[PDB]
Amino acid sequence: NVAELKKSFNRHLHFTLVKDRNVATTRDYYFALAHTVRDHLVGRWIRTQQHYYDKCPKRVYYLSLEFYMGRTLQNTMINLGLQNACDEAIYQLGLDIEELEEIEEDAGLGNGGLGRLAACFLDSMATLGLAAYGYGIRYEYGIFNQKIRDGWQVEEADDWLRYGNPWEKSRPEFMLPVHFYGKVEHTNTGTKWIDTQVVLALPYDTPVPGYMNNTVNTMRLWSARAPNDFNLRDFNVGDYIQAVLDRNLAENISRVLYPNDNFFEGKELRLKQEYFVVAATLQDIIRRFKASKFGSTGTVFDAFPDQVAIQLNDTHPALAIPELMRIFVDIEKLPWSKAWELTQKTFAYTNHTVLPEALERWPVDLVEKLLPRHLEIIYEINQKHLDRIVALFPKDVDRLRRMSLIEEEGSKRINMAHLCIVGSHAVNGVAKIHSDIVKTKVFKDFSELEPDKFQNKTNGITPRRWLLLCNPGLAELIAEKIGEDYVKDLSQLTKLHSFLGDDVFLRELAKVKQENKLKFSQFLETEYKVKINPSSMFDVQVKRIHEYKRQLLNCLHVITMYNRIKKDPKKLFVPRTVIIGGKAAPGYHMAKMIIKLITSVADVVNNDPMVGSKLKVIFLENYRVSLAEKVIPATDLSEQISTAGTEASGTGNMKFMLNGALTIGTMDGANVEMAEEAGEENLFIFGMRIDDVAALDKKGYEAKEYYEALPELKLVIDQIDNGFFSPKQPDLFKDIINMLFYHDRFKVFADYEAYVKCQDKVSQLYMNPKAWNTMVLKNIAASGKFSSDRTIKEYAQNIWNVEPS
Amino acid sequence: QISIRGIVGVENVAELKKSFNRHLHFTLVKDRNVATTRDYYFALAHTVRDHLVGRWIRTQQHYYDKCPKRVYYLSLEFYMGRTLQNTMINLGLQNACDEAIYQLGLDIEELEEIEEDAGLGNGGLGRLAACFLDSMATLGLAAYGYGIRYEYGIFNQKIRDGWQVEEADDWLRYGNPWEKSRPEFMLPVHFYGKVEHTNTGTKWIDTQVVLALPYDTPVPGYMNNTVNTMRLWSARAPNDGDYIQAVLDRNLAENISRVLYPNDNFFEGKELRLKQEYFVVAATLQDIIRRFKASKFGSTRGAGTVFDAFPDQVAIQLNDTHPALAIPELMRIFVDIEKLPWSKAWELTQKTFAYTNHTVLPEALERWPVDLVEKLLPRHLEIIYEINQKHLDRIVALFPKDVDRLRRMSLIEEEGSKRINMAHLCIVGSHAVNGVAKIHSDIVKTKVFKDFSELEPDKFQNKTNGITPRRWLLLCNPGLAELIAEKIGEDYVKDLSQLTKLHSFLGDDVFLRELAKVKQENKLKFSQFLETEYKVKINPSSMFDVQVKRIHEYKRQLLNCLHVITMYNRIKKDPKKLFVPRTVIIGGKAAPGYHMAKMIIKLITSVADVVNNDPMVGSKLKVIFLENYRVSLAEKVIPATDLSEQISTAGTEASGTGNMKFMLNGALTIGTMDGANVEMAEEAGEENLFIFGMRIDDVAALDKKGYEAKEYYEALPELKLVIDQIDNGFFSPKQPDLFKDIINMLFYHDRFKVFADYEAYVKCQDKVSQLYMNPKAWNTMVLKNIAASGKFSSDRTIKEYAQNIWNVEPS
């Protein structure tokens, strides 16, 4: 088995890379290994498809504009049971497998939580044997690579396909046309959408192997191509060369991921992406349905929602609803009511945020020009929707305004969330607190009519990538005590509760953490030229840079610690390495300022000789999935400090819990449920809760009162305001200060005192290894709920109506 | 050739079947139950490429170990066609692969037709490069081809309402199983910026950078151990307003290798074209220098790398002036980067480069505006000026009284907008300059660059073009290849001169029959193709009269067309008279901006509609415009041909290579004494070709006197009828004035004197008709043509370059 892996490796280096070992590159070796590994799942990949054809299980289609997949090599080795053998084979060839793994580019086709949920789900659905496909866009450039230059974020193109992707297979025989612009004619043979521009969607298939089973599912991502055929409407002259160059304009549709996290930008190219992935995906689903054993019978499509479920990852693919209607009515000649019944039973919608700047509201003018037939269909859905509300509440005219899919205020906009609610048989939030707000407040008018529609499905993370892969030390240690059933049923981690008084096991737990810390410290000293204190608490905040996630609040605490040290250098101080990391959306000015502040603080703290090894600050550059795997297992304190009510769930919070970090955080999103499972006393909960925030909004938030009432806050803010951290540019952080005092929607100062006292309690506990690791163990033992396997089981039972196999 | 019989032969087929099935499973990721013909083609291509990896690696090892002088064919074009069949044959695997595919239940022909042409060329220039690579591989020379990996080759041509329309040749849509990317050899290329003159010397600063990423395609030799390489460069944006627009604008850098400029024998001075030329030249020279430094002949001394041995290790052939920037680029690297003195660097440059001239037509000549070059390549403009100055100084020293000679020999044309004459740059920067046939090389030497060759008589040479007898006989015409093998053995494939041995069968009627049958079999096959693509009933006993080449005023498809109408008019005039029936096929792409060429296509299709549908004509005469003429199609139609039309005006066609393909494939030639036609006449005997019309002195005499087209129109009744028909709307009844531009050119601006050769052409055609009625006499002449075609093997051509230009030896 080791011997055969070596032969296979050498075959690929030879035949696939056309390389003698004498001129072989590190990248060649990565590619030879990658192909060797992929060969081992082809059999099951082809047989998984046969199985789905022969037995016709209901299929699940996860439709997302993002899949934040990270690297595939190590994950595939783990899920196929080949890691130990591949490591040994590569070692025997005089090579280091970790070095080959670092060659691989992240498939960074996502922004943050939403896209990473899609990735974990694919892994969970494959492990649970569901007939599930992921459908998205193969962006030529994913989320940008982040560099820091002079303390500022700078963006470089994520050219991830430069050298090829060995994990994908293009299937141009399954290419599909997508239409744009044109016009509508309502003829006597039906409605015709004509004079359209066509863009081709070419699918690329990546295998999604289950963990130690016979399932290999598919992720199918679409790529834009210009069509080749001459239309008699191209008779119209132009330069030949420019016409060929202008093919770029069609191909631009799948060129780059929009790097906005929780923020809507109403750009036309983005709308095209949304319809692009949706039109190609639905056509492909219909083609597979018709070619299946339920493809003939009276109309073939009566069995459709028994054979197809399509999950909408946020409102980004909301156009799927009117497109399915369009295909049913205009092309398949089904009557409206029938089509509409089938549409609702096919689609479910997942809501990921209640922040108003994230909500998709497309101007009707833009949709009219680009997708005239879909506007007509949307207007019709709304008409029949509003007729019913006038029928049920004749006197309530304002309710019609609130429940319409169209917002009429001057420039008219389509509310895509309302489209997703009326077009779906089920709508879910991603944590209890969030799903509650969704149902009872934000879509109150919709839930009162249809209470059974709105559900909760709390998020989760795959314990393959986020334990087995990223933290083998912990995985091995856990498996040695309670066996390895926990991988496929993470609720088994509760059996670790037995070892709470096992002092030898607590030393061994702490040692695994220590080894993870040593190794990441090396990474940090290689990359940042900063001397790391090995016995310091690794205090880590990693996530996209946002005002609501409040990296800024963390930063105020960093300066507070700094100042305390300067005031009394002889005083006892629990040493920390504070790591803050994450990308700012390029056009997000305040996020970019916060980054600059953090790097400005770090430079002052890291180089102050009075501080030395007590406090080091690192801005972690280019935070992404594969770096997430490095830092999270090395963490002691997980910062999850969003203002109560703002973070729908979080998922990084769960990753840290699973890898032996304690959480400091607000009662927000999934933090509440982490407290529920682990016991509130075993997290470091602080600050305002959702009701306390509501009470401060009512009363009116005055930031100045806290700055005057809290001496340590004043010195921190003054240092920032008067140039202590930017001596050559004293006024550099003016935009931040202004925001804090006059426009802070997230109430940083209001939680500052509570946050700082909480941080003191964390330091106390860190001085007591037995107490700390006793608490860590209760966290790990209670983390089973947050496996995405549990999540998918609930989606399967209560929404998709499908069964693990 | 590898065996399919025995214990070992059975195991060869078995192994090919297993490999086929491995690739369909592991590479294509397809069960047989959902596999398509395209999947089967790829599975086979992968299998076939696998079989040359061993030799490809060993060839590179041998070149590293024995360190011979390396040859670098540098071209903007490689018109390669399809690779699958050509590789199987050259590897000796066709019989075995055929057998494997057959046993798997598949149609080998159907799999072969799936393959896209690598149509990265316009015509003869691109195709000569292609033939040359095959020959250099077969002769065992350490040669690389260097080009651009165009995302789109020459456009696919379709005909709509009688006009050419262009569609993008999206040849990489389904991938390319032959190439291998080599990311580690990615190189930077610089553009724009400016020149700084400082204490440390000249710096080229503020440049925008474009990345060149090479892709390698194997070039297998015929039945030897050599697999050489074609390295083609692809343009990429470097990883270093609106973020999204910044990402989208990476397209601008990648546009450098997006599309092939579809001009044949015509200079279009576009900035994107200039970029392409510098791109391929900069990437290539860097990569060549890198290979030189890393080899056993790469030594070190006080300054740095000794490039003393560079010209004994490196020969670079410039295929036309397109990569002329190679000369100042090498000088830039030598002087600006490697710090060699100008004198030494200039001497090494001359010893390294050789230049091949392919056309004397003024409109084809590359003359780049100094303003464009200054903006794009400012340091290269300085180097060109410096080269020119030192070049003029020597001429002033030698000929002090001749003020005009300086003007004529300058690399700069100074009137109006100043332009860089790239041919002059190539002559002074190279130690050898060659034309592509005797007639043409003589014009290059004694007339066009008379001042240059007088100063350096040993510089100018001839190297008459050739074609590879692999693709253009063994591959395209297995029937004829087989027949020749039966009669004289298989040694002709490696020594084409052995075709003269076929003279033993001169009076042998059995063999003359056998030769006719092969031609008939090729005609029957090609007739099928024709009848499924065009609404025509092909007469199978008709003479196949073919003119396939790019549409040009100088190649005179129009003349062919005038003769077609003449024939039509003769049938109408005397319906019951004896007519030797013909299928007249004319095919070729027009450059998209070539107005007159497009009009000529419209004329031909318009004429075809009349002739094909006139019931009085019937099966006597059919006209086909063959759509989308390209290499793989040339391989179908050439073997099916009886008469080859090579009717360019005397002195315009530098060589021609189609002429050679037709000769080798059993067709007789009607043509002028132009290009290699002269040498075809020399080899076969002039009486065995149908030579007609003005020769080069006759065209000179007519130019001096002045050409009055109307004198021929008035003097020749039959021409009058033809021209009046076209002018008055006989062929465009719904648009009577449609061909007004053609008439206007023919009468007042015809640089190629169509009417001047009409009389001699039509009379010559009558003689061809007469001979075709006598099978015994017709095929006797065919035999003397095939038997005399050995000279035109590209092997012969390459040995001559090697011995006289590159100073390397066949192995």
Ligand SMILES: Cc1cc(C)c(NC(=O)Nc2cc3ccccc3cc2C(=O)N[C@](C)(C(=O)O)C2CCCCC2)c(C)c1
């Ligand atoms: C164009 C090309 C073709 C092939 C087939 C390869 N891959 C190889 O494996 N090439 C080589 C294999 C060797 C095996 C033994 C000894 C020497 C070998 C050299 C090569 C090779 O390609 N040579 C280089 C890369 C070359 O450029 O020819 C070499 C020149 C001498 C200095 C070291 C680099 C490759 C890579 C390319």
Ligand SMILES: Cc1cc(C)c(NC(=O)Nc2cc3ccccc3cc2C(=O)N[C@](C)(C(=O)O)C2CCCCC2)c(C)c1
């Ligand atoms: C996404 C994907 C994955 C794979 C692994 C393949 N390649 C296959 O070989 N797929 C199939 C193998 C089968 C083997 C036996 C019986 C049925 C099989 C079906 C497939 C298959 O994937 N079928 C298609 C392509 C499917 O996508 O379900 C189906 C689509 C509708 C038209 C008829 C073909 C492929 C091709 C894709």
Ligand SMILES: *Cc1c(COP(=O)(O)O)cnc(C)c1O
């Ligand atoms: C887990 C993950 C996220 C989500 O992080 P949150 O703290 O829940 O917002 C974002 N980016 C990457 C790379 C991740 O792995």
Ligand SMILES: *Cc1c(COP(=O)(O)O)cnc(C)c1O
């Ligand atoms: C050989 C060839 C040519 C060159 O033909 P000429 O008659 O010499 O101009 C042009 N196009 C193709 C496809 C060829 O194979």
Ligand SMILES: CC(=O)N[C@@H]1O[C@H](CO)[C@@H](O)[C@H](O)[C@H]1O
């Ligand atoms: C728009 C968006 O990405 N929302 C995010 O979705 C993920 C996955 O549900 C949540 O963990 C997170 O709280 C939420 O902010």
Ligand SMILES: CC(=O)N[C@@H]1O[C@H](CO)[C@@H](O)[C@H](O)[C@H]1O
């Ligand atoms: C610029 C160009 O493509 N010239 C062409 O070159 C080929 C190959 O040398 C000749 O056969 C042909 O006569 C000539 O027109």
Ligand SMILES: Cn1c(=O)c2c(ncn2C)n(C)c1=O
């Ligand atoms: C104001 N603003 C932005 O401008 C922005 C953003 N995310 C991306 N962008 C551009 N967020 C979250 C934001 O609040």
Ligand SMILES: Cn1c(=O)c2c(ncn2C)n(C)c1=O
């Ligand atoms: C005038 N003209 C052109 O304009 C042209 C051309 N080949 C391409 N083009 C555009 N030729 C040969 C030509 O004579």
